[PDB]
Design a protein around this ligand. Structure first.
Ligand SMILES: [Fe+3]
Length: 288
């Protein structure tokens, strides 16, 4: 995962990222943001007035200050006609919109703020700082990055190293597991919670598993991300895991099956100076 690089050209920056190269004007004034975390970072840096389009169909509870903005669809259902009609000077995307990069780059300079699951903290810093640098706000960004570092250390200091967690996602009645360096990796990689099974190694899709696997591993914590909440489906993780095999795990018996808010974890708000902070606190409060 290539870090974002910028070179000053007076009125504009020459910007290189994993997907390509763009000329980005300084102080862009009409920004379409498809990544929810970076939307939150815009709010944290007081750049709300620079934003002209957001994915209103997936706008979570903590980003309701952007409901007034023009909708450019959802994080997957990108509305190209809407984006084009706004005439933006900058489009910002993450992993979900990489597939749309060439069409978006025909409308305006398109900055990629991907989170590298193998290098979460560095990519996050580089994403926040590269946005800040467009506006001259490096100093504000560093103070907020330093707040996140502080929250990380508060979380870490409370972790019980004798305990092991499993991370699962639920989608319809299907359960998939995720481990270190996956899309939920920060629970293991940044907050230092031990994985039950270090050998689950996956990215965005996950290992297909069942309630017998979960009992076999017998984790002390189960972190559940229920994709059914995002997709509107009738099935609920709470129903999926209410069975006799899961009931016998240390997790069920100690009431440490923890239902993480998928508006943060699944929508992947990790680029947010305030949303990352809330996710770190959600982990910390679930295990302390
Ligand atoms: Fe998805």
């Amino acid at each position: 995962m290539l870090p974002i690089s910028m070179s000053d050209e007076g009125d504009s920056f020459l910007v290189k990222d994993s997907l390509g190269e763009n000329k980005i004007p300084k102080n862009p004034s009409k920004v379409v943001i498809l990544d929810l975390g970076i939307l939150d970072t815009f709010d944290a840096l007081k750049l709300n007035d620079k934003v002209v389009g957001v994915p209103a169909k997936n706008l979570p509870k903590y980003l309701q200050q952007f409901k007034n903005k023009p909708s450019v669809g959802g994080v997957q259902q990108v509305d190209f006609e809407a984006i084009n009609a706004l005439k933006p000077d900058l489009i910002i995307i993450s992993g979900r919109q990489s597939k749309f990069y060439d069409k978006l780059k025909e409308i305006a300079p398109t900055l990629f703020v991907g989170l590298d699951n193998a290098n979460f903290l560095s990519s996050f810093e580089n994403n926040v700082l590269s946005v800040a640098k467009l506006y001259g706000l490096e100093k504000e960004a560093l103070e907020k990055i330093s707040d996140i570092k502080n929250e990380i250390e508060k979380a870490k200091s409370i972790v019980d190293e004798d305990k092991k967690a499993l991370i699962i996602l639920t989608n319809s009645n299907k359960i998939s597991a995720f481990g270190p360096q996956s899309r939920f990796g920060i629970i293991h990689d940044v907050l230092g919670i031990n994985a039950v099974d270090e050998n689950i190694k996956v990215g965005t899709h996950g290992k297909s598993i069942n309630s017998e696997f979960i009992l076999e591993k017998n984790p002390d914590y189960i972190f559940v991300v229920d994709r059914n909440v995002i997709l509107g489906n009738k099935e609920r993780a709470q129903g999926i895991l209410d069975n006799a095999l899961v009931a016998k795990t240390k997790a069920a018996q100690n009431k440490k099956i923890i239902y993480l808010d998928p508006e943060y974890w699944y929508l992947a708000s990790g680029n947010g100076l305030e949303s990352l902070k809330t996710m770190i606190l959600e982990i910390k409060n679930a295990v302390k």
